[PDB]
Structure 1
């Protein structure tokens, strides 16, 4: 079903799909080959469906945690670029895209969450989570909440959990110990506990998705949020005054957000295996190609060494790096498919209050399998 001769590209609707579209015309200009850009839903789950029955895109863009899962199922393209090309990118980004001594994806960007605040409505930041229960009331004397952020997803709620020692899989002898999961440890339980007890005093709401958080800030209904560099485009153009800084201290310990790497590979069935390699190596990963993508919807700390240290200036990005290096990198193994949903469940359950904090989690230890 994958057609012989052309390119179709898959990337999420929060990154730059209008920036990556403009890059397509320079590729259509020289070689004459067609390059369509797309942004479907549940593409983390749609890809290993369409690929597992001989379909799907030429190229897919996502955090590196799924690609080891796609390398297991056997629906990827093993990339073999020259080592001189691997010398142009920060070496550690390849240690993400290497499941079992062999290559499967190019790295493009380095992601991490960072505290954004409404400099206008709230001048200085809180440095513990602990003071937000007092911070809420003062702004709630003007119809405005302290913090709001997507609670439904685990990516945003994990930073707070990890702080006090909350871990997916224990780091035992190079590889990851699957058999010791740590979502239901004493530190993690108390982390989640604080997210729930924030909500129980109406200082956040339980069912606040992504769209509500963004909009609420981007106009001004609330004075804080937790989001990536990708949301700086809409904030800038919605004309808000905002700094970026550290993700603050749960129990005098730093939030450890899971550090993703926006990476890309090619389909197993695909007949255009060297067509994407000429597109990837030459056009996109450049100080012209990564510019127009960063223009539309920022990536922050890019993987190509040359363009990264040209835009390392912005205190926003530096602060994004500060969180990132203080947090830890996402593991790549297959069960990271299952790990994310185990918590995704357990969070919402206790978040609203449907279940006890301890039961939802001590269940979710089982779910990671």
Structure 2
């Protein structure tokens, strides 16, 4: 079990855990309660496994949207902070940590997309989406483009679609009220597609093409989150970050992710955990300790957010967050993503109309949400694989170690084209193996439990079979 009298905290490795440990020691000095801070591998999926068996950390830090499945799965303690304490965090951040009208976590930090522009190419960026066609003709005359952003993931195209009325589920979330083909969503997506029809954007621009274009000075604007600011400091491109453009006078509504701190329902230290988070972490000094270790971005605590907002990039993030739509914390969100990604791709590729793509998307999303359980997941690929080809055979490694928009991969005495394996990724139902130059080496599909079948980019058959042992 979880051990009484001590606090165990899990937080991801890309966070200021040493700063969090600092706050933990200040808490150990005033109370004698020891605070151990850990950053396990794949913590967001170890936690449900251990908490369901009465073990795990006392506190877990993760994005709010996963906590609704935890709370629906009764793996989280209900928190009841005083009204006086709730007033210190932005009111919308408490909405992100609400499930069935109960508070299930403490909001910590806040994240949302924002308009990123090149101040040299574009000193004063547009306030409206309507201005972007004219701005694009001006810039392409001079060999640049006005705007490029990932058109492949609904997360990036949703702020415009939802600007005039689109929404995932109505909000208590009603999984049978999907707002995907109302008038506002049709209008946003139609405007998006006509931008592509009128040759201001390319239907197949994805995350890397857009990021490369902006950092190489080829386009004046992009759309991304704080996670991408670091690669634009390598750029020496002088960029600003600002509010998203408005559509039909309505703000772009990006999805909002809220870093939150949940309490293990099996923890015998619930009250100790509430005191640490309320009285020690969620203070100007506590947040500063984590932030000096590793920046949080915008934060839910008003007082310290007023200090961080002196950075205009963080003020812009927070402003776009307060105008966006909180990412719904329900597992039925996976049906929203699947249906909407199909619809935006089909509408932008001309394979469907926005009225037909969105109509299908709302039918498929509503039906799948109402149903007990689509694409291939990087968890199902992570590991080491036997690789049969001809009479030849060998092994490849495909760790879930991020690398670009894919993952590191490695061949182990592999003949033929597999000797060039360097990265891997998943595309719906398809596993794709890549060069060190981004070229495609192979394409495979899950053909069963721990088994892949496909072919190289040059015709040779490939079969992947998992390595695994027994005690």
TM-score normalised by the chain length of structure 2: 0.63
- Stretches of structure 1 that go unaligned for 5 or more consecutive residues are none
Query: What is the alpha-carbon distance in structure 2 between the residues aligned to residue 249 and residue 223 of structure 1?
Result: 18
Match of 1:197 in 2: 194
Query: What is the alpha-carbon distance in structure 1 between the residues aligned to residue 347 and residue 14 of structure 2?
Result: 28
Query: What is the alpha-carbon distance in structure 2 between the residues aligned to residue 361 and residue 90 of structure 1?
Result: 34
- Secondary structure of the residue aligned to 2:17 is coil
C-alpha change, 1:170 and 1:229, in structure 2 (3 Å) is: same
Spell out, residue by residue over 1:282-340, the C-alpha distance to the aligned partner (whole angstroms, 9 max, x if none): 55323233225445664444222331223343343443344333334444455345334
C-alpha change, 1:165 and 1:94, in structure 2 (3 Å) is: closer
C-alpha change, 1:85 and 1:221, in structure 2 (3 Å) is: same
Task: Report which of the two structures shows the higher radius of gyration computed on alpha carbons.
Answer: 2
Query: What is the alpha-carbon distance in structure 2 between the residues aligned to residue 50 and residue 191 of structure 1?
Result: 43
Stretch of structure 1 that moved more, 258-267 or 18-27: 18-27
Stretch of structure 1 that moved more, 18-27 or 230-239: 18-27
- Secondary structure of the residue aligned to 2:134 is helix
* 1:176 CA drift (Å): 4.3
- Higher share of residues assigned strand: 2
| Bigger relative contact order, structure 1 or 2 (CA pairs below 8 A, ≥6 apart) | 1
Stretch of structure 1 that moved more, 224-233 or 199-208: 199-208
Query: What is the alpha-carbon distance in structure 2 between the residues aligned to residue 18 and residue 268 of structure 1?
Result: 25
Query: What is the alpha-carbon distance in structure 1 between the residues aligned to residue 32 and residue 215 of structure 2?
Result: 41
* 1:78 CA drift (Å): 2.8
Query: What is the alpha-carbon distance in structure 1 between the residues aligned to residue 274 and residue 252 of structure 2?
Result: 37
- Secondary structure of the residue aligned to 1:23 is helix
CA RMSD of aligned residues (A): 4.0
Spell out, residue by residue over 1:147-184, the C-alpha distance to the aligned partner (whole angstroms, 9 max, x if none): 2223333232111011121122345xxx4444332101
Query: What is the alpha-carbon distance in structure 1 between the residues aligned to residue 84 and residue 135 of structure 2?
Result: 52
Spell out, residue by residue over 1:73-112, the C-alpha distance to the aligned partner (whole angstroms, 9 max, x if none): 2222333556654454345433432323433101112333
- Higher share of residues assigned helix: 1
C-alpha change, 1:137 and 1:25, in structure 2 (3 Å) is: farther
Count of aligned pairs between the two proteins: 364
Spell out, residue by residue over 1:190-243, the C-alpha distance to the aligned partner (whole angstroms, 9 max, x if none): 311232333345533444444443444344332211123343344345433222
- Aligned residues of 1:14 and 1:230 also touching (Cα < 8 A): no
Query: What is the alpha-carbon distance in structure 1 between the residues aligned to residue 243 and residue 82 of structure 2?
Result: 38
C-alpha change, 1:101 and 1:327, in structure 2 (3 Å) is: closer
Stretch of structure 1 that moved more, 97-106 or 232-241: 232-241
- Aligned residues of 2:11 and 2:39 also touching (Cα < 8 A): yes
Spell out, residue by residue over 1:56-79, the C-alpha distance to the aligned partner (whole angstroms, 9 max, x if none): 665443443332232112222333
- Secondary structure of the residue aligned to 1:235 is coil
- Secondary structure of the residue aligned to 1:240 is coil
* 1:361 CA drift (Å): 1.9
- Aligned residues of 1:184 and 1:362 also touching (Cα < 8 A): yes
- Stretches of structure 2 that go unaligned for 5 or more consecutive residues are 365-471
Stretch of structure 1 that moved more, 12-21 or 345-354: 12-21
- Aligned residues of 2:92 and 2:322 also touching (Cα < 8 A): no
